[PDB]
Amino acid sequence: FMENFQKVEKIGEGTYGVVYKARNKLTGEVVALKKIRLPSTAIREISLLKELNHPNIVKLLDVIHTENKLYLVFEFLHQDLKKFMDASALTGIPLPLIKSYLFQLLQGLAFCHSHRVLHRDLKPQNLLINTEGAIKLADFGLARAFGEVVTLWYRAPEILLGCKYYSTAVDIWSLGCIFAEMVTRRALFPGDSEIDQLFRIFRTLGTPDEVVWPGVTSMPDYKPSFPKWARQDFSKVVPPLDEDGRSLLSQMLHYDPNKRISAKAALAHPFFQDVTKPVPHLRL
């Protein structure tokens, strides 16, 4: 039971608490209702995100603070990208659709980053799709406002090396990992711990050094004793992605966050010359 919603049903466990599909009692509308598992600072800052509207961002409809509980109300979409890539594993997602989704996601990130809002925890479970061929990012801005098993697979290397500063580049990294996973039908870096995560990145991209990443050796959790692995070609990592897609991915996965392509620059990349917006085959 809820005093403002009916037919409340559990969708999943999210980063912050249970996620429900719910019907607004007044309007009849179906929404995603997120219970935040337990602060005044967070309420004003998340409430600012109610203004932050774009076709490729999941709309934060409301912030409800009642009975000393906090709920976030979002626009409901029928599938996430995790489920869609599982459902598409035999065939793969068609390349035009991968390109459409990556393009759209970059437009959402470019919008949020232009408004000084980061995600910091992008993952297939917070990328949501609809029947019309759109993809939208959920939960932008929540990590900065708020502070089972956490997925590390999309975490940028500076975060894993204990940098307590964030930048836009953390989201480009995450999205490049997602881009690779859509193409290969395998997670790029499926670490089960922070050091396994780090070392999976190093064994693909090479152990970073002061040449490719000035400042890295002074990172808080950098250890001079890290093994020194050589870097692999993207040609072996993401076949059969073409030269253009491999060049763009390379730029999204630079070690130094400052060298990583911006979302705005990535939209101009030659990979998107032939972008279209296809219809997905969604089984709901």
Ligand SMILES: Nc1nc(I)c2[nH]cnc2n1
């Ligand atoms: N179905 C679904 N799941 C989640 I996680 C969502 N977050 C925002 N809208 C959502 N819709």
